[PDB]
Ligand binder design. Structure first.
Ligand code: HEM
Ligand code: HEM
Lengths: 145, 145
């Protein structure tokens, strides 16, 4: 199932992912927080899963939120680094899904991250071409949920 | 406390951590799996916490173990990247501790990773000086458990 989704990560898709990550991943704290705050702004209902983080309206200043945001970027770093070996990408994606499945986060709910990713990419001037590439990577994770 | 433990990461400790990570982090899959297999070999009592992984003796051939091992190396990558800013190191360490606290992994239990780290370091020509530097980093996590 996840292997089939990984099959959509073509040579061109993997190239656009690496190129955009070279920029987005160069400031994990800044862009990681940008992603989370954008998710909360566009889909307020998702805050329900983050009660432990406390006052998420504090953004970057919220230590728990900042810690979570930085960590999120290392998961993506992991995914990007495994792009050339489907076997490793799949095992890393399935490992990642375990805790999210436990939290009862459906593929549909997880998909809400696509909007924020598109916006963050656009802030760095990476157009629709790149957003579509990232939507395909997210789809690999969705296949595991 | 975690804040006092992070203060123990002196100038040369941070430098030795970076110099050794430059080599160890070069092969996250290989060194990550070596780290886990060594832990299970030297402390068989910890295997119980990893029931979900299945037959851990299969090593690299165990997809779940490989997935977990690779991810473990990105957590260390995260810690190393935060050495410049104590405030960020602390929030990332506390974030990391959440799930380990939930699994009831105590500071003493976590500290068992020091042996495996020392052995992997030694396999790459990094002696006691480096093993002790890493013990200091591990001590920051222990303070959060
Ligand atoms: C690109 C997308 C995402 C990435 C890379 C990501 C990454 C991570 C990572 C690395 C962790 C820490 C390890 C763990 O506990 O599993 C985590 C925790 C978590 N994730 Fe995901 N995640 C993503 C999207 C989401 C979404 C869309 C939701 C919910 C709508 C979600 C909810 C959670 C929650 C509730 C936690 C625990 C937060 C805490 O209490 O500290 N994640 N995620
Ligand atoms: C250098 C030390 C270690 C690092 C960097 C590390 C890293 C990680 C990471 C990144 C995860 C995945 C996210 C999560 O679920 O929290 C994790 C999961 C886990 N860790 Fe730790 N860990 C370390 C040591 C330990 C030790 C010593 C134990 C137990 C004696 C432990 C037990 C667990 C367990 C049981 C899981 C879940 C495994 C699974 O079911 O897939 N960890 N750890």
């Amino acid at each position: 199932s996840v292997y089939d989704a990984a099959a959509q990560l073509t040579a061109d898709v993997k190239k656009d992912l690496r190129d955009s990550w070279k920029v987005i991943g160069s400031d994990k704290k800044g862009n990681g927080v940008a992603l989370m705050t954008t998710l909360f702004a566009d889909n307020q209902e998702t805050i329900g899963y983050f009660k432990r983080l406390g006052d998420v309206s504090q953004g970057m200043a919220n230590d728990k939120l900042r810690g979570h945001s930085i960590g999120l970027m290392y998961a993506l770093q992991n995914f990007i680094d495994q792009l050339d070996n489907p076997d490793d990408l799949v095992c890393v994606v399935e490992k990642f899904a375990v805790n999210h499945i436990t939290r009862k986060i459906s593929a549909a709910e997880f998909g809400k991250i696509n909007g924020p990713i598109k916006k963050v990419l656009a802030s760095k001037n990476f157009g629709d071409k790149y957003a579509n590439a990232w939507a395909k990577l997210v789809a690999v994770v969705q296949a595991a949920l």
